[PDB]
Amino acid sequence: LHHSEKKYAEEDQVQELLKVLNEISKTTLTLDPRYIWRSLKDLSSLRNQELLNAETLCFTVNVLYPDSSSFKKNLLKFITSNHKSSVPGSAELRNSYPASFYSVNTEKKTIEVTAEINCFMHLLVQLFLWDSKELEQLVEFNRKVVIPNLLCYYNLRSLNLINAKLWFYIYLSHETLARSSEEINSDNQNIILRSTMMKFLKIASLKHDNETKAMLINLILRDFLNNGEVDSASDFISKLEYPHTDVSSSLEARYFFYLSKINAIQLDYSTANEYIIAAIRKAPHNSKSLGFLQQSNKLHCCIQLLMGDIPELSFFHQSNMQKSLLPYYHLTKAVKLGDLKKFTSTITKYKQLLLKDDTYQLCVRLRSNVIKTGIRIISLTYKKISLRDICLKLNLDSEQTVEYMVSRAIRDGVIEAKINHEDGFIETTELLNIYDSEDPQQVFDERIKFANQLHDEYLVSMRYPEDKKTQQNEK
Amino acid sequence: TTAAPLLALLRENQDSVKTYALESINNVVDQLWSEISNELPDIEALYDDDTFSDREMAALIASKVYYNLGEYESAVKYALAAKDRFDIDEKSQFVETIVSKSIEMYVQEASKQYTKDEQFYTKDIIDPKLTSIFERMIEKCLKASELKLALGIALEGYRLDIIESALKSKLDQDSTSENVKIINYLLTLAITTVTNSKFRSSILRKSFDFLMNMPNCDYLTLNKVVVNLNDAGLALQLFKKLKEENDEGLSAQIAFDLVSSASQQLLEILVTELTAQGYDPALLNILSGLPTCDYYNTFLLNNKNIDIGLLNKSKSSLDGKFSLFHTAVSVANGFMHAGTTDNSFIKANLPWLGKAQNWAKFTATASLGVIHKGNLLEGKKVMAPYLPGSRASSRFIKGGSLYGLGLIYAGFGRDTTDYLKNIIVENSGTSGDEDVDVLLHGASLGIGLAAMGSANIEVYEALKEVLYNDSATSGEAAALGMGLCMLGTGKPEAIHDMFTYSQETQHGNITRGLAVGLALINYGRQELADDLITKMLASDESLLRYGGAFTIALAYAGTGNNSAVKRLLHVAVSDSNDDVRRAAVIALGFVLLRDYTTVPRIVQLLSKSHNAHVRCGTAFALGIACAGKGLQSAIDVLDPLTKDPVDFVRQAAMIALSMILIQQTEKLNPQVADINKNFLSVITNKHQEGLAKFGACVAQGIMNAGGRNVTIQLENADTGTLDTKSVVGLVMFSQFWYWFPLAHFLSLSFTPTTVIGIRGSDQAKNKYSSKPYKVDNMTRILPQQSRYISFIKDDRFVPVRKFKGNNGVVVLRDREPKEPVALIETVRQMKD
Amino acid sequence: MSTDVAAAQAQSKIDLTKKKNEEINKKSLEEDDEFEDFPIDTWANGETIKSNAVTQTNIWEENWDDVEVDDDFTNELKAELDRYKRENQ
């Protein structure tokens, strides 16, 4: 009855572990273990949540533990203790195995392979805390317990890949506690959090684990951004090592999205634009991914107004993301029309929301782009145009001031005009017919090379999974 | 976090905060690595200035920074500059990363400087700090008390010193057998890891010193070294140890091993040295090998099982009046009946042999000498009704009996050389009749065999006179006979003459004969055969390109060097000369006898390309390479190649399968019985092409060869050494497609597999079971079977030295050497 | 609720047991679903999505309007006032 329910959950987990244990006894590998490990983690996340708070505890007790079973149980005491299903028949077993962590063998200590087992019991305690949706001291206790265990000995390739996924949860739970209710010791412990993450990346370099390296790089970028330590992250992004070989496509989505943030801050709007489109196309359409997409789209609108490119109105309408994106929709219309008065209203109306996402800093730089976009519209509309007419339209000062705006603005080439100060007009330089110039030559070359690069990626990838299947016995 | 407070300290102008800065940066160098790498040149300026005693500390920072960047090369330079403060991180549970890259870097430097001179331990190209961290790593292995780890890094680092210390200290004689065990493991790894001769020679010859200190040990291990280097001084010194013991049984045992493994030239001079040491004449007969032939003869006389209904069946299916058909059956039965002088083929087929004529009746006369191979005492007696002096009826018999007499006496025919030479000198002053050309033809192949590996410049001169006649078929044979005598000499005069006479003639037969004999002459010199390869490959002639491929093959035979195989692969695809494409692919097999595991994967490609000649050489590559233990894959790749439309591939594919599975059981792999019926099925059918019926029938005789008592031993497992006889036979055998008589040379690749026990006082799935069965002595035993046999704990015959576990003659000690015991009579004894 | 063309990523990616945890982690990292936080945060519900006909619910196609001010009242005033000048010319 009650023993049956905890026993069933345990038996699911055992088959998944046993599968990997067999695989790493032949020869440790990276990718074949992970696909199984990801499937197990889903089942554990769903069973911890839905089925009582003591179904983790049964497992933890059931296997041999250094001191983890007692640290697990502590967490459960606080939220109404459990004591049930820890008597023999939940502790008189070590759960079907052939002989490599089987009951008879382990107790006898003809072998002991707590190696794999310890890393999985860590995976449970992280999942279980985010399920509870709780933070306080329990976070601290999770931080303290697992980190030196993993640092008092080197890990095998399989075990390093379990412990990369624990680091993300440690980091996430620390950062949420600051956001629920800021504290003063959260600040000093953040230096500690900061130290371990970078030290980890060195540790993973020696084991030559591709998937372990990538996931830590994603963490360092995120950690700098919420601390706002962009200076240190600017040195980091020009000195990376990221592989895209074995990484999951969630990791790749995240990586590109982080770059777009730092770049936008450094006043690169052209590189930021390329990478934010990369991040979105990797990500799913699902409501699973919903919140990742909103922050991404907030940044994506912002980059375009920083360029002078001005997002589509369709883009808000085809998504059902309208209400989240409502403040960027009012900025889009404002910059396009040239109306500073419309713009100033938008940034006062929605100040609070923008400042939450910490995208308000990026938004104030847009008060400039109204003025510069306004001069580009006026140079399109009239080839030659008096200085005074600009002052009326955009609600600016003297003509001398307007002269200065254009002199600066054509250093980037935004207006693409030039001022005559003895003829008293502004004369734009565009009169297209660049197909009579040598320009398209340059362009076609680039598209051809872009095609060549997709061909190459096709070649290496097409045959590598083919090769696994043909080698593998299935006849 | 930020590194910014830390930069300010360096910049601050007081001495004191500059000393403290290096300490502070270094603590968290794994946290702020990307930050401090930009400003790593500030820290280099503090290294220059001599107002710091933390110069060593400043250098140490640089190492950790460059590892995290990605360049491991730069970190080790500056770790070595730091001097100390790098011996504390060799056992942490966090950072050993900088240290491990030092162990790698010394191995790279070690290879480069060893080749110039063995000493490189006093060069300034090697930092003194670098030597220390390497040394202490190998010491840590010894603290854990496994020497396999310690020896393994020493092999890479080209150290003579450390490998010398480990074996020196593993001698203490608390188990003599265990002391040898550790030397065996390294000897194997030396061969398979070090493909550089200089370093490998030094290690082998050094290993000898440890073996010879012990008073009791396995002396097979001493002999392994001697055979790889072929120094007659180490050979002599090894026998000298056994002469202080005055022990007959050992000396006889290792002499049996040595003749098969080492070269014929090694034996010819070695016995002379031993004669003047003073020995018993028994050992010196055994080193010539005449006793050794007799022991093998006896094994085959007693245990041979032949198929007389098969002899009838081939006879019915393939006609004696049909000359191609008659060649197949003559060859096929001869291999089956091989290894004992039996006359059953002659009497049964007494009218059938005479119906042929031309070179087919020449093939038939020499197949008698395949059956009667060996039997030295009786060699002349069974050949005498054919030999000139009572033969004048046919010129094919007169010459082809001399060829067949050459097979009987191959590698033992020093006296025979004189007799055959009279005949040749007579005929080399003439241009000959067509009577004389055929007669002289078979004299020339024959004397090649008798005088093989003798280094007779008398014979080289003798046959040089025939080449100069310009006789059509006699000159092709003369060229072949020269190559067989002067095997493994690398003489320059001989090389020069044959290569040039190719241009002198327009005859394709002759030109071809020189090209492939030049391969024999450059056997086993490897890159000192290089000058020839360049000349032959650059030649405009297709024939010299045909032979150039075979020159690579024999030169690097039994060594899988990357260079040799590269050249052969390229030649094959890029040429459009049918003969050449075939030859280059056959040559690969010789080079890759060392690693026969890889051959099926490499040549899977080549069988994929659907060109016939290319496919022909690929079947031959599988057959030669894998001629030992059977591979399921090797079989599968050949199997549709017995189905191809081109019939020349069909011939090769079945012959290759027969070389691969020579005497295995159909309970030892159940594909043996199936494949045997597949050959039979083609022959049964008469609706197929004659090319196909020829291919299956010749293959059938190879498959049943010895009466199923012998197997091909490319590389012996008695010492893990290449066999000269096996290589020579096979390359001659691949010429059968261009001259059928040469098939008979495959007999030299048959080496009899048996354990023959001998009294040492007058010389008379998952196979293993814990429940034994008894096996008689002098019955057929395979290389794979041998490892499961172990002399009984209470046994009346026990070997003097723990058993080698592979086929050959092993001397036993008899506890009662004078009480009666039933004996198996020796062929030697039966006669006299 | 889908970012760019709704069908273009609905066919591009679909669920797997393997991916499902990582996706949930992505939305948690930003900290919320960020479409149900926003009504509480402002303490209102939409009326400024009712700015234009196309904004509210996409049941039309795009016009490229963004204020939707009738342009008939201004074009009518130009027409009559111009005629009178010509009448008084």
From Swiss-Prot, chain A:
One of its GO terms (biological process) is ubiquitin-dependent protein catabolic process. It comes from the Eukaryota. Residues 463-475 have a biased composition (Basic and acidic residues). It holds the Pfam family PCI. The modification Phosphoserine is found at residue 437. Residues 253-433 form the PCI domain. Keywords: Acetylation, Phosphoprotein, Proteasome. The 26S proteasome is composed of a core protease, known as the 20S proteasome, capped at one or both ends by the 19S regulatory complex (RC). The RC is composed of at least 18 different subunits in two subcomplexes, the base and the lid, which form the portions proximal and distal to the 20S proteolytic core, respectively. Present with 16700 molecules/cell in log phase SD medium. Belongs to the proteasome subunit S3 family. Acts as a regulatory subunit of the 26S proteasome which is involved in the ATP-dependent degradation of ubiquitinated proteins. This is 26S proteasome regulatory subunit RPN3.
From Swiss-Prot, chain B:
Keywords: Acetylation, Phosphoprotein, Proteasome, Repeat. GO terms for molecular function: enzyme regulator activity; ubiquitin protein ligase binding. PC repeats lie at residues 363-396, 400-437, 442-476, 477-511, 513-546, 547-582, 583-615, 617-651, 652-689, 695-731. GO terms for cellular component: nucleus; proteasome complex; proteasome regulatory particle, base subcomplex; proteasome storage granule. The keyword Phosphoprotein applies. SUPFAM superfamilies: ARM repeat. It comes from the Eukaryota. Coiled coil: none annotated. Signal peptide: none annotated. N-acetylated by NAT1. GO terms for biological process: proteasome assembly; proteasome-mediated ubiquitin-dependent protein catabolic process; regulation of protein catabolic process; ubiquitin-dependent protein catabolic process. Acts as a regulatory subunit of the 26S proteasome which is involved in the ATP-dependent degradation of ubiquitinated proteins. PANTHER family: 26S PROTEASOME NON-ATPASE REGULATORY SUBUNIT, 26S PROTEASOME NON-ATPASE REGULATORY SUBUNIT 1. Interacts with UBR1. Present with 4750 molecules/cell in log phase SD medium. Belongs to the proteasome subunit S1 family. This is 26S proteasome regulatory subunit RPN2. It comes from Saccharomyces cerevisiae (strain ATCC 204508 / S288c).
Swiss-Prot record, chain C:
GO terms for molecular function: molecular adaptor activity; protein folding chaperone. Keywords: Acetylation, Phosphoprotein, Proteasome, Transcription. GO terms for biological process: double-strand break repair via homologous recombination; filamentous growth; maintenance of DNA trinucleotide repeats; mRNA export from nucleus; positive regulation of transcription by RNA polymerase II; proteasome assembly; proteasome-mediated ubiquitin-dependent protein catabolic process; regulation of cell cycle. It holds the Pfam family DSS1_SEM1. Coiled coil: none annotated. The modification N-acetylserine is found at residue 2. Gene3D superfamilies: 6.10.250.1210. Belongs to the DSS1/SEM1 family. This is 26S proteasome complex subunit SEM1. The lineage of its organism: Eukaryota, Fungi, Dikarya, Ascomycota, Saccharomycotina.
